[PDB]
């Protein structure tokens, strides 16, 4: 559980390895490599402990990650669901939120089909 | 509501009285170690010996052996010869064992 | 009409065989019992089925020691 709570994949390039962390995509990965001055093409199994402790310290302090980010996403939905807004209804019936059709498809929000 | 100590004490003593001999019971405290030979038929102590009453010295093991000999000497003088060793809650080992071996050395029969 | 009952077992003739004040000889059976209703006392042994028998010639005595149970003794003559 090195940085930041997740133990990033060794033997892989340091830029992609960061994407395996909740809160970090390729974008925030390209950022933390300049802002800490580390070579994006090197493997994590080849990171200097100096390079490590800097990348770690920066990323945990600049962005909200793992459990906390999951916490606000939950908190954001919890309120939408509680105020009684439409965005909340769709979260309470587990139906598609973003105005898609529900006659067909919508299989990712509902789950596998329940035939009749 | 009894304790492992009480039960252990009881269990080994009942076993001794059953054989009906005079019993050489041994109390062993943190500093001292006493010993009396009792007739449970009459509820009477017959001969006594202790470190506290013999004002004895340093190593508790070596001390015990001495109170053991003390008991035996006073014992045979009274006609007591054979006797049964009540090890109480104490494992026959170290201080207590030494007290016994001393009583034996002194000519006590057990 | 029939019954599933009808069985029973041979009576085992248990109990005290010598009462207090009675003279017994070495080996006389004193109490026949299941478990220890009476417990072996002075000069009294116990057999593998809790049988109380006099160890010496003498006279029987009973004593009830409260929470310790009842005991049977043979007093030497």
């Amino acid at each position: 559980a090195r940085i930041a709570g997740v133990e990033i994949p060794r033997n892989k390039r340091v830029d992609v390895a960061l994407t395996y962390i909740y809160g970090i995509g390729k974008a925030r990965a390209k950022e933390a490599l300049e802002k800490t001055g580390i070579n994006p093409a090197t493997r994590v199994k080849d990171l200097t402990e100096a390079e490590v402790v800097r990348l770690r310290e920066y990323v945990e302090n600049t962005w909200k990650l793992e459990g906390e980010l999951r916490a606000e996403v939950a908190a954001n939905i919890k309120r939408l669901m509680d105020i009684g807004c439409y965005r909340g209804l769709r979260h309470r019936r587990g139906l598609p939120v973003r105005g898609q059709r529900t006659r067909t498809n919508a299989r990712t929000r509902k789950g596998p089909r329940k035939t009749v | 509501r009894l304790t492992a100590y009480e039960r252990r004490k009881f269990r080994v003593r009942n076993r001794i009285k059953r054989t009906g001999r005079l019993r050489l019971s041994v109390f062993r405290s943190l500093k001292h170690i006493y010993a009396q030979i009792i007739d449970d038929e009459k509820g009477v102590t017959l001969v006594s010996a202790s470190s506290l009453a013999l004002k004895l010295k340093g190593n508790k093991t070596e001390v015990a052996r001495q109170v053991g000999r003390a008991l035996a000497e006073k014992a045979l003088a009274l006609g007591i010869k054979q006797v049964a060793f009540d090890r109480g809650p104490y494992k026959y080992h170290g201080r207590v064992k030494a007290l016994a071996e001393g009583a034996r050395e002194g000519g006590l029969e057990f | 009409g029939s019954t599933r009952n009808g069985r029973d077992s041979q009576a085992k003739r248990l109990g005290v065989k010598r009462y207090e004040g009675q003279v017994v000889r070495a080996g006389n059976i004193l109490v026949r019992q299941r478990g220890t209703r009476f417990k072996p006392g002075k000069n009294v042994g116990m057999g593998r089925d809790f049988t109380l028998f006099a160890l010496v010639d003498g006279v029987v005595e009973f004593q009830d020691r409260g929470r310790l149970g009842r005991y049977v003794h043979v007093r030497p003559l």
Binding site: - | - | G1, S2, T3, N5
Partner: protein, 141 residues
């Protein structure tokens, strides 16, 4: 109607009906009582029939205390069989009742209302009865 919900043993030896009541001989709940004057096995059918009589009398109101319960199983061999071939079958339950016991008590009803209800119920019982009211003698028990 009144019967045990379960029991250790299914059939019971008949026993005897000697002597005055063991207990339950004093008023203890209501205002007025009905007391048995002679011994009997009082059947569950009778108890219930004696109860219904009283509640029917009150129409609405009053409270009925039933101080006897039929826990004794009543046995009877099938019709026209011969002796032997075991014990009979259970056909009902009775409550053993010896002289002096308060069987029924009423409360929360006028005196003449209690006198009549206990009398009527008295007629559904296979024994002689006596109507009684609460005394200090009852209070002292």
């Amino acid at each position: 109607m009144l019967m045990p919900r379960r029991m250790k043993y299914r059939k019971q030896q008949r026993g005897r009906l000697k002597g005055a009541t063991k207990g339950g001989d004093y008023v203890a709940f209501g205002d007025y009582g009905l007391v048995a004057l002679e011994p009997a096995w009082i059947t569950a059918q009778q108890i219930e029939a004696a109860r219904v009589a009283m509640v029917r009398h009150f129409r609405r109101g009053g409270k009925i205390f039933i101080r006897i319960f039929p826990d004794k199983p009543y046995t009877k061999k099938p019709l026209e069989v011969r002796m032997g071939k075991g014990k009979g079958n259970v056909e009902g339950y009775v409550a053993v009742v010896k002289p002096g016991r308060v069987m029924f008590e009423v409360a929360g009803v006028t005196e003449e209302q209690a006198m009549e209800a206990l009398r009527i119920a008295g007629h559904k019982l296979p024994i002689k009865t006596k109507i009684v009211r609460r005394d200090a003698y009852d209070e002292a028990q």
